[PDB]
A paper describes a structure:
Fragment 166, ((1 R,2 R)-2-phenyl-N-(1,3-thiazol-2-yl)) cyclopropanecarboxamide, occupies P-pocket. A comparison of the 166-bound structure with the RT/DNA P-1 complex structure with no compound bound, hereafter referred as the apo structure, shows the expansion of the pocket upon fragment binding. The deoxyribose ring of the primer 3′-end nucleotide has shifted by ~2.7 Å to accommodate 166. The five-membered thiazole moiety of 166 interacts with the deoxyribose ring and with the primer grip. The central cyclopropyl moiety is positioned over the conserved YMDD motif of the polymerase active site and interacting with the active-site residues Y183, M184, and D185. Consequently, the YMDD motif has bent down by ~1.6 Å compared with the apo structure. One Mg2+ ion that was chelating all three catalytic aspartates (D110, D185, and D186) in the apo structure, is dissociated upon binding of 166. The phenyl ring of 166 points toward the first template-overhang thymine base. This thymine base, which is less ordered in the apo structure due to lack of interaction, has shifted by ~2.2 Å and aligned with the phenyl ring of 166. Despite no canonical base-pairing or a typical hydrogen-bond interaction between the thymine base and the phenyl ring of 166, both aromatic rings are aligned and stacked against the dsDNA base pair, suggesting that modification of the phenyl ring of 166 to form base-pair-like interaction with the template base would improve binding. Compound 166 in P-pocket almost mimics the binding of a nucleotide and the predominant interaction of 166 is its stacking with the terminus base pair at the P-1 position.
Residue numbers in the entry:
A (entry chain B): 5 to 88, 95 to 428
B (entry chain A): 0 to 554
The structure:
DNA sequence: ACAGTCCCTGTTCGGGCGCCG
DNA sequence: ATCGGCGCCCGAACAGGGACTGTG
């Protein structure tokens, strides 16, 4: 098998990203993995004359004790050439299972003129030794070009199973294979084993999950149910008595929501505060204001019309920390034109770890974006840059890494969760 | 010892570039005879070859004294060649710290002699290292040479030698998997658990192994007994300390001098607990004149006295025990200044340190404490490869109300509370519901974009109003100024309604310090109050008192 | 709808300390 | 004068992004 020639986008160099510090648990796991990849010819040692680098770290696999080597190939993928239909029914299936088939890439060799760009450096504790640098000789997991170059072999491998089970939707994104069906949970789990063994005739899958009856939250990214995802509506308070402060919060909330919903009106509500009153003063709602509120309640309950996905535009996701372990998020492409608004709650590290929550929410939001649109959104994270970069690798378990930026949002966004 | 039989590292020029063609500047006669004598010497040693007119490249050459040595170091101003040499990915990711060293039975410190001059240079790249020795008589043309080994001053030499040394040690490390070798450039910390007799046997195996690869271990650089001078430290068998720090003593100081004093105090803060440099670094603000003389301020001199006070007493560090937990404890010394100590057994510090960074224009102690906890976490991963247990001067309940009420995701790893004042506290707390029987202030402010003049005032539910004219101000400042007025002209309980998310987002974060003088005044008022409720309403929407005060300040 | 001013954060480079040729 | 590479700190110039205001 001859390698496919791969180029960088015009006028762009390879990635040059420093390696971030790793724990002894992760370094010892990485050294063992890379030494075995070098023996099997999958990677090879290089020197400092290769001016490129990509960060590497290790994660513990989903419901497993084994380690998976994860490369932060975000910079290489932006600069990698572009290559050359998304199943709309995958999000309608009852059960959808994610299979890590990244191991299949290690069988296809990589173009020699391109291997220099896949370099990474394994650090050492206390800087005992210099960094030991490796480059890839085969298709690497997490590379934008790996699923494309392997696409021809993958359609061939899956075609018998897809014609034998035409009711099963099978989508591929990077190292992951998304397998959706409408079968019962037990017959669905048997079909996954049928696909694993059918794949096993050619390429190996991550070791069988040790638990087979779905323990709680171990299968977060494994067994996902798209038909149960719910959108978070915008709600307004219902009170018998309203104060001046209560109406001001209402008017400010409705004026902000008027950017997402056209028909929101706040004039008759603002009329109630025309004086210069005390915040605690109770204000009776006039007949005109009561009607204006009730119609706005109808509008916030009705779904938005005329919001469609644009495959050419990037996806953007914003998360809000609402407190009590609850996080609200919105995925959109243009401001105030949300493609989905959801809510995730009661995630790991209950009432202790905020970061463990956010890291899980980013993964859950990303999984939905891959399932629904086949893209990954750029995240606006409500967290400090150093707080995130210090801890995020400790709770990550996905094979992909979305782009993100950090923002300091004023907490006036109480306009998404009641 | 002939050149090392190690494979040369392929080196290229930057794409579409040629070699350097720089003419030789004049040199003094003391250095000319030394360079000629040295160059013919290091031609005999094989490091250098004579070249002819076929070589069109050149680089100026001089010769300085070796660092703390009677030998001469041959240096070349390869500034022109470094711009044209390909970029490298440096494999040296940091500096080893003694606090990360474990206890070992036998310790040896080696140093390779003529390190760069032992590793050959890529044959194809040697043409670009051409240089000319101008003779004494200006009539003589001068002798041209090229480099056969890693030249000193070339940007690729440190990385290639570091990469080359690892390849040379790899077979020996495999032949002895239980021998620990800390490798930094040419200095070798060798540690094993064998007996002292059998250890010297392995050291000789290592010296012979390096000699086969053209790496001599001179007796002058072979240390066999503690104490060990390693990476600027003194390595005693059960304790470690820093090589003597020399603080300069002067009656008048300059910018440069302050810059050296701050640096040495930072280098000392790794083991000396309590070093402060905030007031000394403040003297470096604004002045870019390096030789400008600076009078020591009252706060700066006090800081220098404190540092010398804790520097007169000797401090030592301890080595690392992989079986015992790693513990770090932080204390708040000054405003914006923190010191910490990482230890395993109490009062037996592995290392110390300090965090004194002002992150943001407005912040509080809880933010800075969390920022310092992260700096220690990262530093701990580098030295020991694990996250330490924490002992923080902040109440468990203080942090619970902060991280649950804060809009960003903030977390601190496993930590326990220590009652070592001064403690970290929230100096004021905004009410979640409007206060009954509290005067309601509708504040706003404005400013002209061209005139830079503005107004700031408020109206209340009791009919009270106020408008203050401001000069040389902005829109953002007047909304903060309006909130300051309401806090001034109110009782201990006040309700304030603003239309500025900017002013709201600053105050809602509960800052206790700010680079803005006005915010610090606002903070001072909030601590004096007993109950404060801050509410936001959208501007220009005909809402309540916001409309009344809006017309007062926009005119 | 576009163009500025303000403010804020982050990156980058300069000084210094320290290591080593 | 006059060097390479690395790490750390502190200070400052530059740029990027979001919100507000003024304007066609
Ligand atoms: O998290 C910011 C951090 O990311 C870095 C390296 O981790 O850059 C990588 O990650 C970014 C996060 O979105 C990507 O945008 C970028 O493409 C990728 O190289 C650093 O830039 C930064 O310190």
């Amino acid at each position: 098998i001859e390698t496919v020639p791969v180029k960088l986008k015009p006028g762009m160099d390879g990635p040059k990203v420093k390696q971030w510090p790793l724990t002894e648990e992760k370094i010892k796991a990485l050294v063992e993995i890379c030494t075995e990849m070098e023996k099997e010819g999958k990677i090879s040692k290089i020197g400092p004359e290769n001016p490129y680098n990509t960060p590497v770290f290790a994660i513990k696999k989903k419901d497993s004790t084994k380690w998976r080597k994860l490369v932060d190939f975000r910079e290489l993928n932006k600069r990698t050439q572009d290559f050359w239909p998304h199943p709309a029914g995958l999000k309608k299936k009852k059960s959808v299972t994610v299979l890590d088939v990244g191991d299949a890439y290690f069988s296809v060799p990589l173009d020699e003129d391109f291997r220099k760009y896949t370099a990474f450096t394994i650090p050492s504790i206390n800087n005992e030794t210099p960094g030991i640098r490796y480059q890839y000789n085969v298709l690497p997991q997490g590379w934008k070009g790996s699923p494309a170059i392997f696409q021809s072999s993958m359609t061939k491998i899956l075609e018998p199973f897809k014609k034998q089970n035409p009711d099963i939707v099978i989508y591929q994104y990077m190292d992951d294979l998304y397998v959706g069906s409408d079968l019962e949970i037990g017959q669905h789990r048997t079909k996954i084993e049928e696909l694993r063994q059918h794949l096993l005739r050619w390429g190996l899958t991550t070791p069988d999950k040790k638990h087979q009856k779905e323990p709680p939250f171990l299968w977060m990214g494994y067994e996902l149910h798209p038909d149960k995802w719910t959108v978070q509506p915008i709600v307004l308070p219902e009170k018998d008595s309203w104060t001046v402060n209560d109406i001001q919060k209402l008017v400010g909330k409705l004026n902000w929501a008027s950017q997402i919903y056209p028909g929101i009106k706040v004039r008759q509500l603002s009329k109630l505060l025309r004086g210069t009153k005390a915040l605690t003063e109770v204000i009776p709602l006039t007949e005109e204001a009561e009607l204006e509120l009730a119609e706005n309640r109808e509008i916030l309950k009705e779904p938005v019309h005329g919001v469609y996905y644009d495959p050419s535009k990037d996806l953007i996701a914003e998360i809000q920390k609402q407190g009590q372990g609850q996080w609200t998020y919105q995925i959109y492409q243009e401001p105030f034109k949300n493609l989905k608004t959801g809510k995730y709650a009661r995630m790991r590290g209950a009432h202790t770890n905020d970061v463990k929550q956010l890291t899980e929410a980013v993964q859950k939001i990303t999984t939905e974006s891959i399932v629904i649109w086949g893209k990954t959104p750029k995240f606006k994270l409500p967290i400090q840059k150093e707080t995130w970069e210090t801890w995020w690798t400790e709770y990550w378990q996905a094979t992909w890494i979305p782009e993100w930026e950090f923002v300091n949002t004023p907490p006036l966004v109480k306009l998404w969760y009641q | 010892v002939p050149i090392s039989p190690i494979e040369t590292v392929p080196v290229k020029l930057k794409p579409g570039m040629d070699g350097p063609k720089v003419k030789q500047w004049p040199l003094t006669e003391e250095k000319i005879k030394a360079l000629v004598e040295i160059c013919t010497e290091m031609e005999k040693e094989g490091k250098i070859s004579k070249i002819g007119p076929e070589n069109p490249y050149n680089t100026p050459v001089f010769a300085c004294k070796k660092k703390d040595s009677t030998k001469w170091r041959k240096l070349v101003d390869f500034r022109e060649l470094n711009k044209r040499t390909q970029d490298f990915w440096e494999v040296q990711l940091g500096i080893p710290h003694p606090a990360g060293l474990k206890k070992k039975k036998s310790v040896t410190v080696l140093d390779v002699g003529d390190a760069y001059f032992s590793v050959p240079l890529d044959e194809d790249f040697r043409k670009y290292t051409a240089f000319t020795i101008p003779s004494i008589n200006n009539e003589t043309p001068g002798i041209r040479y090229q480099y056969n080994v890693l030249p000193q001053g070339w940007k690729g030499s440190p990385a290639i030698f570091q990469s080359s040394m690892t390849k040379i040690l790899e077979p020996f490390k495999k032949q002895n998997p239980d021998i620990v070798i800390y490798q930094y450039m040419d200095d070798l910390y060798v540690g094993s658990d064998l007996e002292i007799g059998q250890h010297r046997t392995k050291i000789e195996e290592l010296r012979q192994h390096l000699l086969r690869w053209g790496l001599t271990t001179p007796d002058k650089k072979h240390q066999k007994e503690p104490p060990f001078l390693w990476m600027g430290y003194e390595l005693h068998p059960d304790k470690w300390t820093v090589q003597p720090i020399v603080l300069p003593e002067k009656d008048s100081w300059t910018v440069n001098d302050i810059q050296k004093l701050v640096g040495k105090l930072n280098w000392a803060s790794q083991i000396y607990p309590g070093i402060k440099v905030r007031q000394l670094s403040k003297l470096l603000r604004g002045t870019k004149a390096l030789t400008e003389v600076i009078p020591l301020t009252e706060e700066a001199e006090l800081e220098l006295a404190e540092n010398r006070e804790i520097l007169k007493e000797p401090v030592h560090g301890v080595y690392y025990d992989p079986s015992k937990d790693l513990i770090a404890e932080i204390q708040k010394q000054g405003q914006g200044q923190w010191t910490y100590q990482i230890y395993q057994e109490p009062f037996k510090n592995l290392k110390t340190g300090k965090y004194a960074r002002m992150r943001g224009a407005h912040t509080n102690d809880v933010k800075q404490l969390t920022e310092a906890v992260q700096k220690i976490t990262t530093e701990s991963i580098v030295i020991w490869g694990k996250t330490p247990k924490f002992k923080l001067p902040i109440q468990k309940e203080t942090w619970e109300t902060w991280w649950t009420e804060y809009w960003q995701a903030t977390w601190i790893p496993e930590w326990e509370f220590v009652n070592t004042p001064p403690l970290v506290k929230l100096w004021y707390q905004l009410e979640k519901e409007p206060i009954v029987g509290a005067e309601t202030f509708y504040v706003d402010g404005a400013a002209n974009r061209e005139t830079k003049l503005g107004k700031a005032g408020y109206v209340t539910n009791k009919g009270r109003q106020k408008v203050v004219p401001l000069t040389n101000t902005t829109n953002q400042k007047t909304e903060l100024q309006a909130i300051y007025l309401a806090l001034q002209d109110s009782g201990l309980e006040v309700n304030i309604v603003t239309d500025s998310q900017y002013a709201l987002g600053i105050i809602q974060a509960q800052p206790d310090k700010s680079e803005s003088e006005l915010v610090n005044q606002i903070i001072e008022q909030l601590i004096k109050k007993e109950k404060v409720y801050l509410a936001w309403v959208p501007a220009h929407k005909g809402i309540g008192g916001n409309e009344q005060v809006d017309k007062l300040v926009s005119a």
